[PDB]
Write a protein that binds this ligand. Structure first.
Ligand code: NA
Ligand code: NA
Length: 285
């Protein structure tokens, strides 16, 4: 609608921050046309990027130049969230999420890929590497939306109030923390995203979907290299407990808690995150 136009306009603004050339297009999936922003050398290994809830692929601007030197990066807009992907059938269960991603891989012509993701996209990645390990090279999970530990009860109050601008600002103020401000373009886009009343693109809890805490049983079964990163100031849960749990259960995991950052780790400490991910991704033998 009218709000939808304002959101699409804000998204296009945010994309002026993209530091390199890229190709935007849609791929077909059984859950709808999924928006991709692709960058980097066309013969380089594949890297799928999954944004946090409400942020869209635009949030990768301070990481994309570093990662697209050595990888063909595909920044994927999670279908059913506020972004350019266009939902058909609602994506509802954790099985659906992995099927959606298989279709994305398929439409992109990819047998395997590296994946890196924040928050919601981080939780997609854990779900994907569990259900489709054969399609995953190396996996990077940053500030995951649950997955390793339960949210603070608070999280649901903030989520429930995402019904207009006031709610979005309140969410942003809380999630960023007192030490970090979003770039004004991203601030605007996220607010306009929430203002846009579109239920098909509104994130909501579903029966056998997200949010989800993976069981000891599931986590012990992980068979791919995982890099797990939390910020010391993570507002959404006790990152120490998530760290301890992941470290104990996941075979060969590299897990860490980064100083002077909260939830939005790839945005707050891009210099560190950029290189840490490059180092991990090129760590395969
Ligand atoms: Na802030
Ligand atoms: Na915390």
């Amino acid at each position: 609608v009218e709000s939808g136009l304002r959101f699409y306009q804000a998204y296009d603004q945010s994309l002026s921050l993209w530091p390199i050339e890229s190709e935007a297009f849609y791929v077909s999936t059984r859950f709808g046309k999924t928006h991709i922003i692709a960058s980097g050398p066309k013969d380089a290994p594949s890297l799928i990027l999954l944004h946090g809830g409400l942020f869209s692929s635009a949030m990768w601007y301070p990481n994309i130049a570093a990662w697209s030197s050595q990888f063909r990066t595909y920044a994927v807009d999670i279908i059913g969230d506020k972004n350019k992907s266009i939902p058909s059938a609602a994506m509802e269960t954790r099985a659906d999420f992995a099927e959606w991603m298989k279709d994305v891989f398929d439409s992109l012509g990819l047998e395997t890929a590296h994946l890196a993701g924040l928050s919601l996209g981080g939780s997609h990645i854990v779900n994907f590497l569990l259900r489709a390990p054969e399609r995953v090279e190396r996996a990077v999970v940053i500030s995951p939306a649950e997955a390793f530990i339960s949210f603070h009860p608070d999280v649901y109050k903030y989520a429930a109030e995402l019904t207009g601008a006031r709610g979005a600002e309140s969410y942003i103020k809380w999630i960023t923390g007192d030490s970090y401000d979003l770039h004004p373009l991203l601030q605007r886009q996220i607010v306009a995203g929430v203002e846009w009343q579109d239920e098909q693109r509104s994130l909501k809890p579903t029966e056998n979907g997200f949010p989800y805490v993976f069981t000891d049983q599931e986590l012990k079964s992980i068979q791919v290299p995982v890099l797990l990163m939390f910020g010391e100031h993570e507002a959404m849960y006790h990152q120490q407990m998530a760290f301890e749990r992941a470290s104990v259960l996941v075979p060969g995991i590299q897990a860490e808690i980064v100083k002077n950052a909260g939830h939005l780790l790839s945005l707050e400490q891009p210099e560190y995150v950029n290189q840490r991910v490059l180092s991990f991704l090129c760590g395969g033998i």
